[PDB]
Amino acid sequence: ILQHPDGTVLKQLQPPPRGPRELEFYNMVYAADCFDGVLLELRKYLPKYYGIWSPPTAPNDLYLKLEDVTHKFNKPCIMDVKIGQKSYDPFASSEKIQQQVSKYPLMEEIGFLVLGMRVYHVHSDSYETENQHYGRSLTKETIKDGVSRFFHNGYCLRKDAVAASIQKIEKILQWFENQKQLNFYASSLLFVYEGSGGEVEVRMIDFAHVFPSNTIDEGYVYGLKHLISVLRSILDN
Numbered sequence: 001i002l003q004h005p006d007g008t009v010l011k012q013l014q015p016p017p018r019g020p021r022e023l024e025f026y027n028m029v030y031a032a033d034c035f036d037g038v039l040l041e042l043r044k045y046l047p048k049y050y051g052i053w054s055p056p057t058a059p060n061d062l063y064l065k066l067e068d069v070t071h072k073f074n075k076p077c078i079m080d081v082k083i084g085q086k087s088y089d090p091f092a093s094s095e096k097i098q099q100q101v102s103k104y105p106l107m108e109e110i111g112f113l114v115l116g117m118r119v120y121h122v123h124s125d126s127y128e129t130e131n132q133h134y135g136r137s138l139t140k141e142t143i144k145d146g147v148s149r150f151f152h153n154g155y156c157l158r159k160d161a162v163a164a165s166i167q168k169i170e171k172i173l174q175w176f177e178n179q180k181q182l183n184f185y186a187s188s189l190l191f192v193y194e195g196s197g198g199e200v201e202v203r204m205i206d207f208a209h210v211f212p213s214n215t216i217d218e219g220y221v222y223g224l225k226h227l228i229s230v231l232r233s234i235l236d237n
């Protein structure tokens with residue numbers, strides 16, 4: 001992810017087949033002749049899509065030009081949460097499934113994984129960052145506190161941001177409960193709130209493993225529900 005001052009990010013396509021698949025996903029959803037009511041509603045929850053981009057002197061070098069979801073914030077606090085029970089897709093090999101499950105074997109049980117967070121602290125004028133190893137360390141015993149960390153500004157728990165996050169996730173959950181045409185593996189929610197009341201972004205990102213389906217994305221729904229339940233419990237701190 002490269003942040004552009006014009007308020008966009010450039011995401012370089014991952015190697016095949018993942019990068020091409022994410023390109024086709026955006027192309028399908030933001031197709032200018034799409035009157036699919038499911039896909040039209042989905043746009044609300046994605047970064048705005050500005051199409052494929054390449055450098056003027058390098059058409060080989062493929063990027064997606066996406067809305068920077070953090071742009072409108074002064075001191076954005078950002079958390080990426082991978083959603084679902086499985087982060088391997090329907091066409092993974094035994095070896096690939098093993099790789100994905102071993103990365104975080106609690107995915108089936110918990111239904112989400114924190115990929116990282118960046119939290120602005122007021123009383124130090126600085127950022128705390130957590131990497132992939134933070135979220136992969138969390139167990140069922142520590143997931144509530146693991147998530148709570150995101151909402152600590154070094155003086156209070158930002159229950160406004162927690163409440164707002166529940167409300168926005170609920171809308172995404174409603175979308176998933178009214179579609180049976182896409183299943184999403186190893187995709188994420190990007191949470192943003194203002195670190196400098198109730199001003200929040202919750203957006204879906206990372207679509208290298210989205211597949212056509214005939215059924216409810218039961219794994220994604222479980223993840224959303226469990227995440228909402230955790231956030232709800234935090235409101236009682």
Ligand SMILES: Clc1cnc(Oc2cccc(-c3onc4ccc(-c5nnn[nH]5)cc34)c2)c(Cl)c1
Nearest residue numbers: 001047067068069070078080116117118205206
């Ligand atoms: Cl925990 C964490 C949070 N954010 C990260 O990268 C950023 C930082 C600031 C903004 C973004 C961001 O802002 N808008 C975004 C739209 C899409 C993506 C994206 N798509 N696929 N992977 N990332 C990322 C987007 C991403 C990172 Cl690398 C880690």
